[PDB]
Nucleic acid binder design. Structure first.
Ligand SMILES: NCCCC[C@H](N)C(=O)NS(=O)(=O)OC[C@H]1O[C@@H](n2cnc3c(N)ncnc32)[C@H](O)[C@@H]1O
Length: 484
RNA sequence: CAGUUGACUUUUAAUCAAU
């Protein structure tokens, strides 16, 4: 125990001996800080409302003791509200010197405006709820370090009330997304995180052991496979907003653990789903902001429908400056190895993802559909019905990052199995990201999955745009870090 | 930088003073 910590405890003892309880069970708060401020919006200075009564409760952020009159600022959930104390008015005024900054306080009184004009709660009765054992770090010199801000988000939320509104806005996004799919005739569902075998995307899984069953399971990397099984089952419209786990590095776009949505629509193509996602995201922004304009890192992202639609091949061929057909992997190897020697030990199929990610992805700041992906990098999308080599798939980009991939689902078992067999070769060759074949899934397709359109959507990434954050850790409440 | 210490009956990164 240090000195300051001990000094706080010595003050607690004084308050306990004085008569108060050390840690009360409850406080009957009647008003919130912002509700008082909103009520007296633009009231003239030196006003009073002794008729009215209020009771607030929060944390002491400031404390300006000026002899026989004391001031303070109470920080609740909503905002800051000023307190006023006086000797021949507030009971046990002497014992206000045993309060410290950081303590949780509850007060009763009436509202009034100072000479300056700020709305203030005239304390007629106070109750020390909690005694903080450490000093509050100010915005000035305490919490500027980003990593300490993440480790102690509680401290962050005290110091920076701006951070509070980020996660509130995050919640509203989900609520809107949910209400949409709910009202659009989709069923919310829960699939297991503990899977025996993974599949749905290219990533390395997490592993874990279970004692009762005595077998090594994997953490789910995608929602697809099990939602696909429900389609086979009979459900036509399903969706889920669950946590997924990919054992990979960390950056502004990628985080090992992340929330993401997946909806599925029986007897529909990727065109049908495209119109839905347009209505979703357009209305979402229009609801949140009021315009179709999303501030993100000093840019105005235009979500006015319809969204711009480009082809994967045509866009790459243009912006990468390719004289040949990019689907030709042999010629792309030549071009790549010469122009991009860093993409030498990258496999031939992934060479498209990497090149598209360099030349095309960053230019897509506005919401842009990227229709007609290659077959090489799409194992779960039914083939294109005109151009050979491509599939019915679109990925929605915005802010120079992928939001929502949407295949037109492959329901042919024979085709699917041979793609899983192709995928199984790539793992033997040398590819950690390519998962293994789910045999039970392939069987589920054999019994017959109806033709459908599946959606994916990174909830965390969509948050970053709408909440306007640089890194992904800024839209995660408690990010993962290496302990010490 | 806070805490301590004592001052101070509309201050708002309250101020002065003491260690
Ligand atoms: N059947 C149609 C496709 C279904 C979705 C598909 N199984 C899938 O998971 N695709 S994904 O691209 O791997 O993930 C979908 C979105 O999830 C987001 N995502 C993916 N990996 C991460 C990570 N690591 N962190 C955060 N967000 C992530 C991102 O927006 C992706 O576009």
């Amino acid at each position: 125990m240090n000195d300051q910590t001990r000094q706080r405890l010595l003050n607690l003892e004084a308050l306990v001996e004085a008569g108060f309880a050390p840690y009360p069970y409850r406080f009957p708060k009647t008003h919130s800080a912002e509700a008082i401020l909103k009520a007296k919006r633009g009231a003239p200075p030196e006003s009073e409302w002794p008729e009215e009564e209020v009771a607030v409760a929060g944390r002491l952020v400031a404390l300006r003791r000026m002899g026989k009159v004391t001031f303070a600022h109470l920080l609740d959930e909503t905002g800051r509200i000023q307190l006023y104390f006086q000797r021949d008015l507030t009971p046990k005024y002497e014992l206000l010197k045993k309060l410290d900054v950081g303590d949780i306080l509850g007060v009763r009184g009436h509202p009034f405006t100072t000479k300056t004009g700020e709305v203030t709660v005239k304390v007629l009765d106070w109750t020390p709820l909690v005694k903080s054992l450490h000093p509050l770090p100010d915005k000035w010199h305490g919490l500027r370090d980003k990593e300490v801000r993440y480790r102690q988000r509680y401290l962050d939320l005290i110091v920076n009330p701006e951070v509070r509104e980020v996660f509130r806005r995050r919640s509203e996004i989900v609520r809107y997304i949910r209400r949409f799919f709910e009202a659009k005739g989709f069923l919310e569902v829960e699939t297991p995180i503990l899977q025996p075998t993974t599949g749905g995307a290219e990533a390395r899984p997490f592993k874990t052991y279970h004692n009762a069953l005595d077998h090594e399971f994997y953490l789910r990397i995608s929602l697809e496979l099990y939602l696909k099984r429900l389609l086979v089952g009979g459900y036509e419209k399903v969706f889920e907003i669950g946590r997924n786990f990919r054992n990979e590095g960390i950056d502004h776009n990628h985080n090992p653990e992340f929330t993401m949505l997946e909806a599925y629509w029986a007897y529909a193509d990727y065109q049908d789903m495209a119109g839905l996602v347009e209505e979703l995201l357009s209305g979402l922004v229009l609801h949140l902001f009021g315009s179709h304009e999303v501030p993100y890192q000093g840019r105005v992202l235009n979500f006015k429908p319809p969204f711009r639609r480009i082809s994967f091949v045509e866009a790459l061929k243009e912006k990468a400056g390719l004289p040949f057909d990019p689907l030709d992997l042999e010629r792309l190897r030549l071009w790549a190895d010469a122009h991009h020697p860093e993409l030498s030990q990258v496999p031939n199929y992934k060479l498209l993802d990497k090149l598209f990610g360099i030349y095309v992805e960053p230019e897509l700041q506005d919401p842009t559909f990227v229709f007609d992906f290659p077959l090489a990098i799409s194992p779960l999308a039914k083939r294109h019905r005109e151009k050979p080599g491509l599939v019915e798939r679109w990925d929605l980009y915005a802010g120079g990052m992928e939001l929502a991939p949407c295949y037109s689902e492959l329901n042919d078992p024979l085709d699917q199995r041979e793609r899983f067999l192709e995928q199984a070769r790539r793992r033997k060759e040398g590819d950690e990201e390519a998962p293994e074949p789910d045999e039970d899934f392939l069987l589920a397709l054999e019994y017959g999955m109806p033709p459908a359109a599946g959606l994916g959507l990174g909830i965390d990434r969509l948050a970053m745009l709408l909440t306007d954050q640089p890194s992904l850790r800024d839209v995660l409440l408690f990010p993962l870090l290496k302990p010490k």
